[PDB]
Amino acid sequence: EFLAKMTNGFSGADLTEICQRACKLAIRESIESEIRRERERQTNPSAMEVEEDDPVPEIRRDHFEEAMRFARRSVSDNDIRKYEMFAQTLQQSRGFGDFRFPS
Amino acid sequence: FISIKGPELLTMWFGESEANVREIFDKARQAAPCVLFFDELDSIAKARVINQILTEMDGMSTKKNVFIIGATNRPDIIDPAILRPGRLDQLIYIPLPDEKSRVAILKANLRKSPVAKDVDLEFLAKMTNGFSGADLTEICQRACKLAIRESIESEIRRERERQTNPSAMEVEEDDPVPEIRRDHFEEAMRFARRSVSDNDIRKYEMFAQTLQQSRGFGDFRFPS
């Protein structure tokens, strides 16, 4: 809900991108975390993690906090006024307005 | 209430008397609670004095309660420097007259003329639909002209009676048209014409949409 009312003028195809940028930003760290775990110097059987450590099991908070920095609204204000102007080109129930039948 | 008009305005800069608005402003300073009213201040935008009002409005203090209401008909052609906050901020849109306003103005123009009591006006109100306020003020002069024609013509035959004898003479004034009857409006309505079209009221609606008109996010609430 806090991510909802912060993105204000964003189109529906723009905030569907940041929930892929955050997934890419977490897959980068989950690939990179497995590099050091196999590249342990003197990788000895002593004190070995027989259990999977799972450093990134799910998308955390700072992935969205970092993926939000590259957000950009695609539609401007100058072109939404074009569709509002076409909506005004439809006469839009304007003219006389209310009248009543006689009694 | 003072009032300067279009032709009184642009005749300053057509003859290069640009520094001649200081007197019409300090005359407004002398009468403290006034509302000086420009009229058609876009009249010089056919081809200055907007700058001469512009350097004067900021120099005018606020403890005096003089207000500057300006009217126009082409709101896009106006100088945008007049719309900076501090100088002239509010943009009130005056629409075409609706029904109750129409019956009000129609009764208002017939204060002087005696009208017959069976002349309806609510039926004349909701029949004229897209008429501007300056068009239905014309038919309550066309009907007066159409009744004055018949009241002049009726006096011609009364003095041009053949063998105008003193026998059976109307010593009383007959008064054939004492007031505006019904068929004068029924005949004067035939020449009615709306002045403003539909294509140009959409221009003012479009300028009203050029003002962003409270659009964007909309409702939000403070947290609890």
Side-chain angles (χ1 to χ4, degrees):
Chain A
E1 289 91 3
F2 191 77
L3 196 39
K5 53 197 176 76
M6 209 48 63
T7 80
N8 205 1
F10 274 6
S11 78
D14 294 19
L15 83 164
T16 194
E17 182 262 359
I18 78 168
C19 47
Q20 286 181 13
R21 175 81 44 87
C23 300
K24 194 187 293 178
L25 199 68
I27 196 49
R28 174 193 304 174
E29 194 180 2
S30 163
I31 286 296
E32 190 265 350
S33 196
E34 296 301 311
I35 285 303
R36 54 99 179 169
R37 258 175 46 195
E38 67 98 16
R39 219 194 50 191
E40 294 161 347
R41 296 296 98 194
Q42 47 99 31
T43 311
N44 46 1
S46 53
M48 213 55 246
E49 312 284 330
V50 296
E51 50 93 24
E52 198 70 17
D53 315 327
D54 293 308
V56 189
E58 81 284 341
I59 290 184
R60 295 165 307 138
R61 180 191 297 260
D62 49 353
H63 300 104
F64 278 104
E65 191 177 359
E66 184 46 54
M68 203 57 206
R69 213 160 64 193
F70 313 137
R72 43 183 297 266
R73 43 191 84 196
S74 136
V75 54
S76 87
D77 186 272
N78 197 270
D79 44 356
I80 195 177
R81 212 155 45 186
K82 188 67 63 65
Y83 304 138
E84 202 74 35
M85 192 284 271
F86 183 73
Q88 289 318 297
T89 313
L90 193 148
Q91 291 206 17
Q92 209 170 353
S93 297
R94 290 179 176 161
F96 48 93
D98 288 340
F99 90 111
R100 286 183 177 173
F101 269 44
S103 313
Chain B
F1 175 83
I2 82 168
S3 157
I4 83 166
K5 329 168 187 180
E8 214 273 339
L9 177 68
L10 83 159
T11 191
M12 292 151 182
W13 84 283
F14 212 76
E16 289 300 85
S17 182
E18 316 203 19
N20 209 38
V21 307
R22 313 183 87 259
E23 85 274 4
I24 73 174
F25 263 111
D26 76 335
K27 187 206 305 304
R29 291 183 183 174
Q30 290 178 335
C34 61
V35 279
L36 66 96
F37 170 77
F38 298 142
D39 199 350
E40 317 289 276
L41 64 97
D42 62 74
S43 160
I44 77 157
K46 69 178 301 166
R48 52 180 85 90
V49 200
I50 279 298
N51 193 272
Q52 205 56 50
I53 313 178
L54 211 50
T55 175
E56 210 274 343
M57 203 170 313
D58 295 352
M60 173 205 59
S61 158
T62 40
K63 300 308 168 186
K64 280 136 188 179
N65 44 7
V66 49
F67 308 112
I68 306 182
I69 42 180
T72 177
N73 302 326
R74 293 198 283 275
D76 55 353
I77 211 168
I78 212 173
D79 189 324
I82 212 74
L83 311 164
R84 187 149 285 106
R87 298 176 171 96
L88 273 178
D89 45 6
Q90 271 70 78
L91 268 299
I92 311 298
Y93 168 75
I94 292 305
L96 277 196
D98 57 51
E99 189 260 4
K100 292 179 179 179
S101 84
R102 269 200 302 281
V103 63
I105 186 170
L106 204 52
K107 291 180 179 179
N109 285 170
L110 298 194
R111 284 195 192 93
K112 315 297 181 191
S113 313
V115 64
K117 189 48 62 195
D118 66 325
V119 177
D120 198 3
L121 288 177
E122 289 91 3
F123 191 77
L124 196 39
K126 53 197 176 76
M127 209 48 63
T128 80
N129 205 1
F131 274 6
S132 78
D135 294 19
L136 83 164
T137 194
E138 182 262 359
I139 78 168
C140 47
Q141 286 181 13
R142 175 81 44 88
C144 300
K145 194 187 293 178
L146 199 68
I148 196 49
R149 174 193 304 174
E150 194 180 2
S151 163
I152 286 296
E153 190 265 350
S154 196
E155 296 301 311
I156 285 303
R157 54 99 179 169
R158 258 175 46 195
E159 67 98 17
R160 219 194 50 191
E161 294 161 347
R162 296 296 98 194
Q163 47 99 31
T164 311
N165 46 0
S167 53
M169 213 55 246
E170 312 284 330
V171 296
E172 50 93 24
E173 198 70 17
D174 315 327
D175 292 308
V177 189
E179 81 284 341
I180 290 184
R181 295 165 307 138
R182 180 191 297 260
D183 49 353
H184 300 103
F185 278 104
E186 191 177 359
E187 184 46 54
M189 203 57 206
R190 213 161 64 193
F191 313 137
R193 43 183 297 266
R194 43 191 84 196
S195 136
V196 54
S197 87
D198 186 272
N199 197 270
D200 45 356
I201 195 177
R202 212 155 45 186
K203 188 67 63 65
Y204 304 138
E205 202 74 35
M206 192 283 271
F207 183 73
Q209 289 318 297
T210 313
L211 193 148
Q212 291 206 17
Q213 209 170 353
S214 297
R215 290 179 176 161
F217 48 93
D219 288 340
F220 90 111
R221 286 183 177 173
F222 269 44
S224 313

